[PDB]
Amino acid sequence: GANLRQDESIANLFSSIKTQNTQPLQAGLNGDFNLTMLQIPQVTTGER
Amino acid sequence: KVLPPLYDPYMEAAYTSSLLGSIAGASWTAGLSSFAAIPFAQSIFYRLNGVGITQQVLSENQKIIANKFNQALGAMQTGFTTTNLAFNKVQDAVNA
Amino acid sequence: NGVGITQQVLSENQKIIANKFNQALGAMQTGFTTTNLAFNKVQDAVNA
Amino acid sequence: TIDVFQIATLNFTSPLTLAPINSTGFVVAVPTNFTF
Amino acid sequence: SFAINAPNGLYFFHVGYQPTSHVNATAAYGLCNTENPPKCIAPIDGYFVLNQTIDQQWYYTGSSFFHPEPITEANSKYVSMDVKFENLTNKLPPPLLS
Amino acid sequence: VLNQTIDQQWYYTGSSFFHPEPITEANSKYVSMDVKFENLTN
Numbered sequence A: 001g002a003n004l005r006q007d008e009s010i011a012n013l014f015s016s017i018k019t020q021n022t023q024p025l026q027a028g029l030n031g032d033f034n035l036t037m038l039q040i041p042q043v044t045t046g047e048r
Numbered sequence B: 001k002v003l004p005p006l007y008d009p010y011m012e013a014a015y016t017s018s019l020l021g022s023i024a025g026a027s028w029t030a031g032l033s034s035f036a037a038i039p040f041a042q043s044i045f046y047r048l049n050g051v052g053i054t055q056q057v058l059s060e061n062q063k064i065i066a067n068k069f070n071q072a073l074g075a076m077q078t079g080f081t082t083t084n085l086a087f088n089k090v091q092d093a094v095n096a
Numbered sequence C: 001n002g003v004g005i006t007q008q009v010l011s012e013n014q015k016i017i018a019n020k021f022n023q024a025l026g027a028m029q030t031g032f033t034t035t036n037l038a039f040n041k042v043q044d045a046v047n048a
Numbered sequence D: 001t002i003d004v005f006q007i008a009t010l011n012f013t014s015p016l017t018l019a020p021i022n023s024t025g026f027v028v029a030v031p032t033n034f035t036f
Numbered sequence E: 001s002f003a004i005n006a007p008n009g010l011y012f013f014h015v016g017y018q019p020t021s022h023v024n025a026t027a028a029y030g031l032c033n034t035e036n037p038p039k040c041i042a043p044i045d046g047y048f049v050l051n052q053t054i055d056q057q058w059y060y061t062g063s064s065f066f067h068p069e070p071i072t073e074a075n076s077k078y079v080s081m082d083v084k085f086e087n088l089t090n091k092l093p094p095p096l097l098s
Numbered sequence F: 001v002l003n004q005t006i007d008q009q010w011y012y013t014g015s016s017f018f019h020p021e022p023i024t025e026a027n028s029k030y031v032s033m034d035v036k037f038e039n040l041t042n
Ligand SMILES: *[C@@H]1O[C@H](CO)[C@@H](O[C@@H]2O[C@H](CO)[C@@H](O)[C@H](O)[C@H]2NC(C)=O)[C@H](O)[C@H]1NC(C)=O
Pocket: A028, A029, A034, A035, A036, A037
């Protein structure tokens, strides 16, 4: 029961993805603000 | 047995990426039903304007504000030491 | 109106809004099943 | 579907991203239909 | 929100405004004319949208429902100059008229 | 605020940053009479 409740709580927390509109952030400088630290790097050599 | 977490780290990455992409918006409307495709820099400047900084100051100190924000984001690295309280909380959760 | 719906729309779609509200109140019954999380919480409190 | 269990992968598809326009202003998705 | 009685507490029915269909509307941060002291306006609890009631003819719509309406002092507020605002030389709203 | 852009000449400044600006209807609102308010003749 404890594990089931934890799973339900985490699913509830992560469910915000399905109903959240976003915009595609530019890689690196977003205007003059540098968000490279918080963005996932994209490398073609391997998997994402 | 130690059960695996409900989600792959890729799903958590998707959650955090959606959080990063959800930051920008109108930030002045009455409700939450409409999404405005306002870029990140414009949203940050609008947040600064709502804070109490007039548009003349924002227009004059554009590069200065951007540089200070970038300096803060760069200094975010140094907080992952034992001195910081939040990192201590992370290590405390791991230790528990 | 406070949500962000102007008075012109509210005056135009009065019956439509009332019908949607009534449909929501009538569909409130369907939530008393084992699938709903809040009903599960009620039964969990009773079980504790 | 009542013979063998299948293994699926959880994947949350976020709603389509509203790409900002290079015009003067911006594009906003304003509702035209709603429910309660 | 409506609260009813549950066996060991209170059961809340949170009624919320859920949109189903959206429309992509060309909006403006604000509008103002060409005067030596400029007079720039911004929407109140809404957007300055472009689509006609049924381009330089700007209307006002609510945040939670698309319904273009003429821009007046009822749904607009006076703000300082912003360089992202639209410079209007024709079809000025009554707030922008001198 | 009172300081000049660079006394009875009053300017407007933001809460979070000092930058005096001319007082207009954009940054001011009409309120009822208050005794502590400054009576301006010029
Ligand atoms: C934006 O921030 C990123 C990440 O902090 C910077 O990229 C770093 O640049 C330095 C200096 O060239 C390199 O040594 C690092 O390897 C880079 N990556 C990281 C993760 O630190 C970048 O220079 C910043 N500025 C711009 C204009 O993109």
